[PDB]
Design a protein around this nucleic acid. Sequence first.
RNA 1: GUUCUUUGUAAAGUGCCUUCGAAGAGUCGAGUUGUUUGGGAAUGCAGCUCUAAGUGGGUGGUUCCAUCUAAAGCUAA
RNA 2: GUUUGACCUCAAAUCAGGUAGGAGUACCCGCUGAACUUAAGCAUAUCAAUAAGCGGAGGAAAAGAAACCAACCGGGAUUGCCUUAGUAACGGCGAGUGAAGCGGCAAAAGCUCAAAUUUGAAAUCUGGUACCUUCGGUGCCCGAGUUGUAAUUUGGAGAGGG
Lengths: 186, 51, 60, 184, 80, 122, 72, 130
Amino acid sequence: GAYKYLEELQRKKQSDVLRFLQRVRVWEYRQKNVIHRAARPTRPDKARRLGYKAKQGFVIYRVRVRRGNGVNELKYQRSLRATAEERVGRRAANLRVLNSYWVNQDSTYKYFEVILVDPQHKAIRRDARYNWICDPVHKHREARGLTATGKKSRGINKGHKFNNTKAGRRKTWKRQNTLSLWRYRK
Amino acid sequence: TGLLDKNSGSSLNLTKEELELISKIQRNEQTDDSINPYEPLIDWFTRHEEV
Amino acid sequence: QQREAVRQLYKGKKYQPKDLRAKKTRALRRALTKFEASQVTEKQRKKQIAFPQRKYAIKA
Amino acid sequence: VKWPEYVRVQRQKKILSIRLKVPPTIAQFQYTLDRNTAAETFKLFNKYRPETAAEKKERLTKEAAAVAEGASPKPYAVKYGLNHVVALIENKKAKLVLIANDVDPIELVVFLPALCKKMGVPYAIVKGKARLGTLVNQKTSAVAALTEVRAEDEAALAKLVSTIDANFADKYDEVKKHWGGGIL
Amino acid sequence: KNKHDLVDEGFNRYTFRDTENLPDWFLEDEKEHSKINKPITKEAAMAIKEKIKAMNARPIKKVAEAKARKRMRAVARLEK
Amino acid sequence: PILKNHFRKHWQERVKVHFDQAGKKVSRRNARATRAAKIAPRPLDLLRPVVRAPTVKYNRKVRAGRGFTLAEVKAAGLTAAYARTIGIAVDHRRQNRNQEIFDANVQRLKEYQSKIIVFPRN
Amino acid sequence: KKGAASNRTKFVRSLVREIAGLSPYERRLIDLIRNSGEKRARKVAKKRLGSFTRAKAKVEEMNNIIAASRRH
Amino acid sequence: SVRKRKMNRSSVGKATRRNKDKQRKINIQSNPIIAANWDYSLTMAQNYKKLGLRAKLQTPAGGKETEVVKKLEELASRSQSEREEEWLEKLYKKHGDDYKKMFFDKKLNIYQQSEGDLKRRLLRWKKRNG
RNA sequence: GUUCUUUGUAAAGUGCCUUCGAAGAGUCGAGUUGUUUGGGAAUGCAGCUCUAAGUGGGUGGUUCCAUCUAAAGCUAA
RNA sequence: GUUUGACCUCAAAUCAGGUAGGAGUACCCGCUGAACUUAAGCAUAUCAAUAAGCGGAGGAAAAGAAACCAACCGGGAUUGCCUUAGUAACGGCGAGUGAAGCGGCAAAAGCUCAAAUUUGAAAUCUGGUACCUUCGGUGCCCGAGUUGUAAUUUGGAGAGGG
């Protein structure tokens, strides 16, 4: 194919080709708006393996976020990527945030390219592989951390290590902090 | 440098070369010399055609 | 008499007036139509003809 | 004078395209096939337009209107998708692979000239993705390949290979070296 | 850290960049955003505050004036 | 002399008393009756395998597993995709290592295949 | 079948390796093998990367860059 | 409450639904043989053992041929297209049974099909004909 | 149940023989400040520095062994 | 050719068609986050990953088909209940905090993309438009699209032939 050549190309980020590509594009993205729409994905390989199909109803938005946070280390423990996903969720409120990836970074700003599906588009409402997003249980997945990075920041996975946050940390706290009393007292 | 030397109570100074090296970090200006920033791409793999 | 006349000139075509349309409720005037919900993918239909859920009884 | 935002941006991007030192896997583009050889490549490539949507529809209704009431060889056309061209190189089925110099993300087609030099596929970086688009019923094509050919066009194709080898690959053996864009 | 250690650290995300041929409206947007946040000390901030402090920073005049401020404050808290 | 009382928090907000024990038993029996009224001739549950429990403590005991395997189903003489339509639970991630467990399951499948009456699609 | 060889991906990784050039530290690292040797080369690589097993694979990778570029 | 207070006061009327007796006794639907022989006074598991059929394949927690013959009774109890038929007519009339020659023919076997495909399809053609 | 349509060298499945055969990067990781956990094993997460590999990589268990396939997504009770 | 024409990017239009906000908020998913108090006076700690504040969903939400647990004669998505169990572990080892595997049971269900050429044919889709048996279908047209929509393939492998 062609995307394996692309995939293994973008794994080298400080390599002289992709160094130059990233040098031009970081400046070019500064000259535009903060949240603006991309004509097409810059990394179509990574877009596609995160589930971007180049068809009507699929949108790529490019987004910018400030970096960082002991006053200057009063932390703010939510990610930069979740902040970005939420902002594009509000400017494009008719869409549904599917996934997002890293494109270019800087001293001040990390950039992302969110991928968005139009659930009202009839090319999405048919085709039984993508019409799950039209179900109203996906209205703002990025606002509730149901995206890839949100599920990471929530700490939702499997095992010993995620026992405090496997069904969600609020749910497990409320469950284990409940005096359960039966009719015939145990 | 505002700090006191361990060898002697006199103020620890910096050499010209070190001061040059600090500045060349902060404006990024190529620290290790005797290298080309722009080497020709020596095609170490495409030299031999595949059968 | 006016409304049913407008119903007759807009008979059986896409885009009839927003008052002559069904009222239902907002959440149901979104939400995938019966065709778009029962629409299964091309692969699952092959899997469903090849292996439908067979009816059985266990004793004799 | 005062220009718009986007006009200033594309003019700034134009002068930025010149004034920076560029890595030799890029600027291996823009060292591209000249006017005569480009016109002669297309004089062959225009004979293999993929059958347009209207032409295909009318012919396949002609099949229906005839065959339902009252042998053909496999037809040859240019091959035009990047997944399909980089499939065809490494098969190895490509005899002439045409590569556009102007691609929206440049990173897309950077491996392709050197992968063609690796496989032994006689490639030519031709100027314009629009110009490739014209011969292929698409707005843009990025890549166009010529796998198989009619025997009338076979000798012309083999000579097109040899002309491109001599004109392109031999004049631009220095292009694998030399970082472009040192223009004062 | 010796010379040899810093020569390693010198190769950044931002090395191998031309700076003399390029137009100023581009470099003035790069140089703002090409600063790698290296860890600091209090020990260094001390000396850099001792380096910038000039001669007329604290004369007799401004010392006497500083006490003239604080006397007025000590008066203003007996005005209540 | 020890005792530990976890009533330092606002415990009085989260006190769940299960008065609905009798109500929820009725509710599950109604659920089973409904499911058996919809799935008429079929049991109410899939055919589950015999399995040896882990840990030095419980390796004496034999228990229900999730599903068989592609191996146990093939050795029985049928396919995994077809086993599910006949109501045999299939476990892809489980492995076969013990011969006694294997043979017990194959005979459980074989006796099941003798006792069943599969309806035709017509 | 842990890392099944895959003739094609070995080719693709090495194909991108030669085209992309080297990262500025690897560019120093390959100069450092020729002058100072693998001793200091692994020392810088370990400080640069995460662990020592990282520095093993990386200096060997760079030694194969040298082994191909110089001889064959 | 706030909303319930008004709704119990208003002249709109409550949307009263008396669906409690329907929760216990749900009619059996998927099989008419079972639908005729199901004693609703008995429970689920009692109506399974009455008929004979096993209700739970795992041994339950706790303490526990009249109709199955009728089921057994009702359980013990692809053509070709015009163009495909005419294609097989052509192959048989030109060759007969020489499948090697029949499949190496460019004019009639345009799809380069094997010998086994040809003998199977021709026998389907021969069974439907004389 | 009754009935109208089905087609096209169309769509599958089983077993054997024969030829091949990829797997999610500013991500894992490392350091680091801060938060957080029963998690002393440094439990999770967030920011910042640096940043990988494919007979890979992660997680456990007294020379090794076992068990998973991350960094993509849906799904009732 | 000092002309004409492809594209690329960026706009506009009371353009055609859509969609987002606000309410409710018990439960549910997030973000943000105290204090009174309790600890011997008390920067840790505790109340508490609580209340208040802010956003976002549904009939449930979330979770979920292992980068899981174990150490067995091995189990096998999640969730919930009994048990583990005030156990392991944390803590001026102080006040206090405090699980999970196993076993039983409730309920159970599995799958889908990206990454290998359809290349003997973009097989795909949206809109406009005229009919019809109208949650749609059919015909024609403008497009989206090769910087990749379809079919095949997802490790339980899988694919091309015989």
